[PDB]
């Protein structure tokens, strides 16, 4: 739940998960399944691409470190709209009636 949340990616190879939790591939598959039953993560599993694509994360307590991570994500989208907005000012100049 920690690894998906903190990352801006939301697909992880089982290799990364295997190394972290010191589990075999048989047990990553159970662990992922349990998260889904209890409702602590929801998602779907490709054991043919070898990913776990999580699609929802349970909100939890947000501590000092996480706010900084949350914050940066927001600066990127704020700047992205502003850049994008100049072109849309530029184009279709004739009419703004």
């Amino acid at each position: 739940i920690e690894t998906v949340f903190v990352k801006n990616i939301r697909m992880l190879s089982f290799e990364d998960i295997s190394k972290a939790t010191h589990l075999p591939k048989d047990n990553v598959e159970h662990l992922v399944m349990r998260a889904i039953s209890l409702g602590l993560l929801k998602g779907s599993i490709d054991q043919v691409n070898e990913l776990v694509t999580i699609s929802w994360v349970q909100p939890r307590i947000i501590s000092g470190d996480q706010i900084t991570k949350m914050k940066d994500r927001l600066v990127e989208w704020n700047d992205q709209v502003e850049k994008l907005g100049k072109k849309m000012e530029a184009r279709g100049q004739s009419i703004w009636v």
């Binding site: 072109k87 849309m88 184009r91 004739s94």
Partner: protein, 266 residues
């Protein structure tokens, strides 16, 4: 003085031509004033024309022989209207037929193919059967083989082209290189890799060490005796994305839809 350029060519000392030519260039203006540059032709003018022409033609060959392509280009341009105006009675030379052969090679060797076809159209009606194609065959047939895409027939005409010397070896040597680069571009699309041996045969070398050196300079790494044509292609492409003009030429989704609404609403 004027006459010295004419006998200097016969010596065979062709740098001596060029170092002699500056006085003759001032004296060539005097020659130009005698003819009206052929806006009327008369028989007084007909003696004079031979004089004006003779100076240009021997400079022209002499320049090619010292590998001064630039100077050659200017000469050819002066000469061309003189053959062009008037019913024949002194509008050709022994030298002309050879001269047109050399100019056609210069365009091919610089790879200005655009001007190679324009020039031949204009040329056609002076060489059709009147000087005919007798020496002119050499850039013409080469051309037929390059259009077809027979880089093979093209290579052979160059290879047999060194037995007969008139002075065409100053542009044959350049055309040998022109072919390799053309082949080199086409084979990137075809495949990613050719073994070292298959490269030598296609791109026309006589040493396996030259083949490898050429590849390094051209931005293909040979690693494990397999060339990677894809390298250069990625790098050229990366460069186009590096410079910016770029957003409008491709056109965004947003940009297409903004253009529709404003066309209407005027």
């Amino acid at each position: 003085l004027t006459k010295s350029l004419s006998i200097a060519f016969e010596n065979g000392d062709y740098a001596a031509c060029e170092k002699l030519l500056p006085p003759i260039k001032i004296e060539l203006i005097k020659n130009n004033l005698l003819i009206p540059d052929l806006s009327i032709q008369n028989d007084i003018y007909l003696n004079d024309l031979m004089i004006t022409k003779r100076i240009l033609e021997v400079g022209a060959l002499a320049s090619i022989q010292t590998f001064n392509f630039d100077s050659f280009e200017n000469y050819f341009n002066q000469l061309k209207p003189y053959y062009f105006s008037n019913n024949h009675k002194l509008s050709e030379s022994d030298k002309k037929s050879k001269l047109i052969s050399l100019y056609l090679l210069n365009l091919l060797s610089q790879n200005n193919t655009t001007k190679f076809h324009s020039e031949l159209q204009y040329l056609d009606k002076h060489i059709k059967n009147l000087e005919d194609d007798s020496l002119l065959s050499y850039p013409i047939k080469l051309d037929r083989w390059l259009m077809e895409g027979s880089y093979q027939k093209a290579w052979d005409l160059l290879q047999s082209g060194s037995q007969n010397i008139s002075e065409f070896d100053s542009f044959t040597d350049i055309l040998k290189s022109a072919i390799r680069d053309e082949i080199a571009k086409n084979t990137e699309l075809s495949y990613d890799f050719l073994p070292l041996s298959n490269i030598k045969a296609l791109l026309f070398f006589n040493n396996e060490k030259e083949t490898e050196k050429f590849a390094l300079e051209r931005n293909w790494p040979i690693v494990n005796s397999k060339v990677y044509f894809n390298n250069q292609s990625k790098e050229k492409a990366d460069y186009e994305d590096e410079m910016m003009h770029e957003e409008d030429q491709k056109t965004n989704i947003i940009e297409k839809a903004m253009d529709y609404a404003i066309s209407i609403e005027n």
